[PDB]
Ligand binder design. Structure first.
Ligand SMILES: Nc1nc2c(ncn2[C@H]2C[C@H](O)[C@@H](COP(=O)(O)OP(=O)(O)OP(=O)(O)O)O2)c(=O)[nH]1
Ligand code: SF4
Ligand SMILES: [Mg+2]
Ligand SMILES: [Mg+2]
Lengths: 868, 186
DNA sequence: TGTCGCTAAGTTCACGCAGTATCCTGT
């Protein structure tokens, strides 16, 4: 009778079906000897509300307190007589539950005997401010059904669940191959110690042409690659994809080149030719149903792909839209809106992976277009078909097949990117650690995950969580740096997860910090036992430390090393985000005093560490809220290491948990300003041998807002300034190279691509206030004006400053690289690039180096030294 | 016309507005912009050539304890423009009494404008008495001023000072006043 | 419909303050 299945996604509708939560997942079937998708509809998820008894009777807030004691019986009578009749509540079940409370509400006793009352979801809902003569507050009123079920049953992330006495559904409700009905939340439990099962992953890529007359989008080709056993607890499979399906729709106006039949026949029989977009979409829905994918992945799928598909379904009125999800419905969710929550619910039950969002969360790149991601991870070359070439592609069958193969290659690239970044296993691990639903975890953002993590930590520990909600404080300290160049060995010490460590050490917990609703709250008493937040932060820190130690194992594959590095970075970011959510003003657990306490203790620890290091009779030169740089005044490496170990032990002697480590050793240092330096990291190899690697932190060469010409020039200049060659030869080399680059630029030898400057928009082009024509914004508007894929918010835009005789301020002349390569009346702005793009970078770089000054740089570059 | 005879005109031919402006200029050897514009346009009207006016202004301002080169640096351009030598190069006409009445209103430290309009009745009475005007003539001029007919007051002044029963002309320009005075005298 | 925090250098613009130059008004 027991029914065991591994659950992935949960979908709820607070209006259509009240008190009904769907759980989608996989279940084992021997007949097919396979895992098949199923949907279990937990019904009768009774709403719960906790009523806080008052200390004494109050005459409806009119006569104030009267002193009459109130007991549980009186509270039950009051709720049964007044509240129940007033709000049209028929049946309810009551009990007395002793619970503790520590959150942001005043005059709520820490540990009190609340009266729990449960009633059916369909009945009306109590109001938040509801107060009576016996109780002073009602909580958990708006707690969603899914949240109640998850928290109450203790389910934390995807896992194997067992169901007792399933009931077959009267009529089909979902598109899966197995349906079960659970009549109460108490019949579902979780089973531990089992292997996660394989899932089906479908990566889709669509090529679309924007309608000329209607100024809208009409899909023309859709390809997908599906793997039927993509694991989630082992390494990604090779080859990543098992099978695929391609579909192409002839344009409403253009016609095939009288050879499409023969070309398709000689190519393969796995491609579907559709006469219209309607047939194409119908075939897509049928294929999605038959495959029943569990993880649909793509590029900008949340932003532009899923939304386009749903809108096109609505526009062409393709029957059975509900198949695009897993449930069965008739009224599509209203489109538009902010973010992709509507788009997410439009395919409920099917996890969605936008490689763009995952890449933003995990890796850091100059641009997030498909080309840049492909070129930065897999190290390949991505061919971009011009938008005109697509509309004109249906003129030769050769070019039609070329476009289809380009779509296929994009799909394969997306799948390989997903595998390489290990998006799915990492998402599953993070979801299990946090506790939210996987579909939400893959959508980015850290507040949701931290909220659910603390929710679980507090619910399982007999606390009452706060109801979901319907520069600020002193932060890090940066020491004044003694800017300059250093040739001896500089030792960089740094702390390990300073903020979580502070939380652990000083017992900074929700249940310990005696708040009072911009001062710094007092430190908690030592004798208090460990709290909830310290426990969760310690669990996360322990997992991160274990992963790091595992990385330390010698003789590891470079790819596995990259995977471990990404995972460790993710865990550190998760701990840091757990700290940060304490400062979010829109967070369920906004605790500004707690974040202030954490930051204040961090500043105090940094100041004390600086004091100790100074008392050791050394020189301090820098530090950013957890790090300190020390001058050695020595040359032998062994002495450097001995001093480092000595100082490490001396510093660590004073902290119970906090650990200081040797963040690095620098042979040559170039400290320009705060948060800006370069150095030569020294990596030992054995027998005293030490290799060198150039590390830049904060320089202008490591930012996407400077031209590639300046980037390369600064890279070479720093390389020289850091080497061991004598000063005179370094200066002569710098002079020669600067003259060479000046001559090259003046003669146009440098290529076009080295001129681009990248900037990322924050809002849409229109929403930006018309405050002049800030280069990026300007170009964005131009791109929107032309007939191509739009550039929405959170997008990197590349622009090149050119010359057209505008005689306007140089900023206003920003143009697009494609424009310059196209227009015959625009040319690069040589003087701008050689004056405001190169000279400032090299001048900042060579600021503390004697022998070079702004005038010399200007002269060498070939610029006129008049205005310099 | 000669620079030296300008003073004589100031004694006799100059209308009271120009008489006040000239008196202030010789008292302080400096005139604010409005006074400068008005007096320069009037001296242009009488016939003072660009060279003559330049010499006169140079000599008068140098006594105000300012550098001669400062004069050539600053006021030379103003003079040239007043004579239509630069810029749009327009032969700007001299101010008419109506403009002077309705032009920039004088304030403390200023001496431009039509005295009949911009002088308080007591001050105008004192000034008329200073010029040895007969008490009856001063009273008649004051009555005309109180009647808002300042042009009639200036005509009465001309009649009394030139010993003519009737002016015989409708005074509507200070240069017209000077021309009539010169015709009567010369 | 939620979109972690603070700190800090840096670019582009909008304005004080002072200095230089040219251009005005009328009938
Ligand atoms: N809220 C928030 N704080 C951050 C973030 N990144 C860094 N911090 C702050 C709080 C961290 O405790 C402090 C330490 O930064 P680090 O880069 O040195 O990493 P951490 O010390 O956590 O570990 P590690 O140096 O890798 O051993 O910086 C972040 O993304 N969000
Ligand atoms: S009426 Fe004309 S001429 Fe007589 S004082 Fe007035 S402005 Fe001068
Ligand atoms: Mg650190
Ligand atoms: Mg002046």
């Amino acid at each position: 009778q027991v029914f065991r299945f591994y659950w992935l996604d949960a979908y709820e509708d607070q209006y259509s079906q009240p008190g009904v939560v769907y759980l989608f997942g996989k279940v084992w079937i021997e007949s097919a000897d396979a895992y098949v998708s199923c949907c279990v509809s937990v019904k009768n998820i009774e709403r719960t509300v906790y009523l806080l008894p008052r200390e004494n009777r109050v005459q409806l807030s009119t006569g104030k307190d009267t002193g009459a004691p109130v007991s549980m019986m009186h509270v039950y009578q009051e709720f049964n007589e007044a509240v129940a009749e007033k709000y049209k509540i028929m049946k309810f079940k009551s009990k007395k539950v002793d619970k503790d409370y520590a959150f942001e509400i005043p005059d709520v006793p820490a540990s009190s005997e609340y009266l729990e009352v449960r009633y059916s979801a369909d009945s009306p809902q109590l109001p938040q401010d509801l107060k009576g003569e016996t109780f002073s507050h009602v909580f958990g009123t708006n707690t969603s059904s899914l949240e109640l079920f998850l928290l109450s049953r203790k389910i934390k992330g995807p896992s194997w669940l067992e169901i007792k006495s399933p009931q077959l559904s009267s009529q089909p409700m979902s598109w899966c191959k197995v349906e079960a009905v659970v009549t109460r939340p108490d019949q579902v439990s979780v089973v531990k110690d089992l292997a996660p099962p394989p899932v089906v992953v479908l990566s889709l890529s669509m090529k679309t042409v924007q309608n000329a007359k209607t100024h809208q989008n009409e899909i023309v080709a859709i390809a997908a690659l599906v793997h039927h056993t993509f694991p989630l607890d082992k390494a990604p499979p090779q080859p990543p994809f098992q099978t695929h399906f391609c579909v192409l729709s002839k344009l409403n106006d253009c016609i095939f080149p009288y050879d499409y039949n023969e070309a398709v026949k000689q190519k393969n029989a796995n491609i579907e030719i559709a006469l219209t977009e309607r047939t194409l979409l119908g075939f897509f829905l049928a294929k999605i149903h038959k495959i029943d994918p569990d993880v649909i992945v793509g590029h900008d799928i949340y932003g532009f792909d899923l939304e386009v598909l749903l809108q096109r379904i609505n526009s062409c009125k393709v029957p059975f839209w509900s198949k695009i999800g897993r449930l069965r419905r008739s009224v599509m969710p209203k489109l538009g809106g902010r973010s992709g929550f509507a788009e997410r619910n439009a395919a409920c039950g099917r996890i969605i992976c936008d490689i763009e969002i995952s890449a933003k969360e995990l890796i850091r790149c100059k641009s997030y277009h498909l080309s840049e991601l492909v070129h930065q991870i897999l190290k390949a070359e991505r061919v971009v078909i011009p938008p005109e070439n697509i509309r004109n592609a249906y003129n030769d069958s050769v070019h039609l097949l070329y476009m289809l193969e380009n779509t296929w290659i994009d799909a394969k690239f997306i799948l390989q990117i997903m595998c390489e970044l290990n998006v799915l296993p990492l998402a599953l691990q993070i979801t299990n650690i946090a506790g939210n639903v996987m579909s939400r975890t893959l959508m980015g953002g850290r507040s949701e995950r931290n909220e659910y993590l603390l929710l679980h930590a507090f619910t399982e520990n007999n606390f009452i969580v706060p109801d979901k909600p319907v520069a600020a404080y002193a932060g890090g300290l940066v020491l004044e740096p003694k800017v300059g160049f250093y040739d001896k060995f500089i030792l960089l010490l740094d702390f390990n997860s300073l903020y979580p460590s502070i939380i652990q050490e000083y017992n900074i917990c929700f249940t310990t910090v005696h708040r009072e609703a911009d001062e710094i709250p007092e430190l908690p008493h030592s004798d208090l036992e460990m709290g909830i937040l310290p426990r969760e932060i310690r669990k996360l820190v322990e997992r991160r430390r274990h992963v790091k130690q595992l990385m330390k194992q010698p003789d590891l594959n470079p790819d596995l090393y990259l995977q471990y590095d990404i995972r460790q970075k993710a865990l550190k970011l998760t701990a840091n985000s757990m700290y940060g959510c304490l400062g979010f003003s829109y967070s369920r657990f906004y605790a500004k005093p707690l974040a202030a306490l954490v930051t204040h203790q961090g500043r105090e620890i940094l100041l004390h560490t600086k004091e100790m290091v100074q008392k050791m009779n050394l020189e301090v030169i820098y530090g950013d809220t957890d790090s300190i740089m020390i001058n050695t005044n020595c040359n032998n490496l062994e002495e450097v290491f001995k001093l480092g170990n000595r100082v490490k032990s001396e510093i660590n002697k004073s902290y119970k948990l906090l650990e200081i480590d040797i963040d690095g050793i620098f042979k040559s240092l170039l400290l320009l300003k705060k948060k800006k330096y370069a150095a030569l990291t020294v990596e030992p190899t054995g027998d005293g041998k030490y290799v060198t690697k150039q590390e830049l932190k904060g320089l202008d060469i490591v930012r996407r807002d400077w031209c590639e010409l300046a980037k390369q020039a600064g890279n070479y200049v720093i390389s020289q300034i850091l080497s061991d060659q004598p000063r005179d030869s370094i200066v002569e080399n710098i002079q020669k190279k600067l003259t060479e680059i000046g001559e090259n630029v003046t003669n146009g030898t440098v290529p076009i691509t080295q001129y681009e400057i990248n900037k990322a928009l924050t809002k849409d082009p229109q929403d930006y206030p018309d405050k002049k024509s800030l280069p990026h914004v300007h170009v964005a508007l131009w791109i929107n004006s032309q007939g191509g894929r739009k550039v929405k918010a959170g997008d990197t835009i590349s622009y090149v400053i050119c010359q057209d005789g505008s005689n306007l301020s140089a900023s206003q002349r920003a143009y697009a690289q494609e424009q310059l390569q196209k227009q015959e009346n625009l040319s690069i702005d040589t003087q701008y690039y050689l004056s405001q793009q190169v000279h400032p970078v090299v001048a900042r770089i060579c600021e503390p180096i004697d022998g070079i000054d702004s005038a010399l740089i200007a002269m060498w570059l070939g610029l006129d030294p008049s205005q310099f | 016309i000669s620079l030296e005879q300008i003073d004589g005109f100031a004694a006799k031919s100059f209308p009271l507005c120009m008489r006040q402006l000239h008196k202030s200029l010789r008292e302080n050897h400096h005139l604010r912009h409005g006074g400068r514009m008005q007096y320069g346009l009037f001296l242009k009207g009488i016939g003072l050539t660009l060279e003559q006016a330049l010499q006169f202004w140079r000599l008068e301002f140098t006594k105000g304890k300012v550098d001669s080169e400062k004069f050539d640096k600053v006021y030379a351009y103003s003079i040239r423009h007043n004579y239509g030598k630069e810029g749009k190069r327009t032969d700007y006409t001299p101010y008419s009494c109506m403009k002077v009445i309705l032009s920039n209103p004088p304030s403390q430290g200023d001496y431009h404008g039509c005295p009949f309009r911009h002088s308080d009745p007591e001050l105008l009475k004192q000034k008329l008495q200073s010029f040895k005007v007969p008490s009856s003539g001063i009273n008649q001029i004051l009555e005309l001023v109180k009647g808002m007919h300042y042009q009639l007051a200036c005509q009465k002044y001309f009649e009394l000072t030139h010993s003519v029963d009737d002016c015989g002309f409708s005074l509507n320009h200070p240069n017209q006043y000077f021309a009539e005075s010169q015709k009567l005298l010369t």
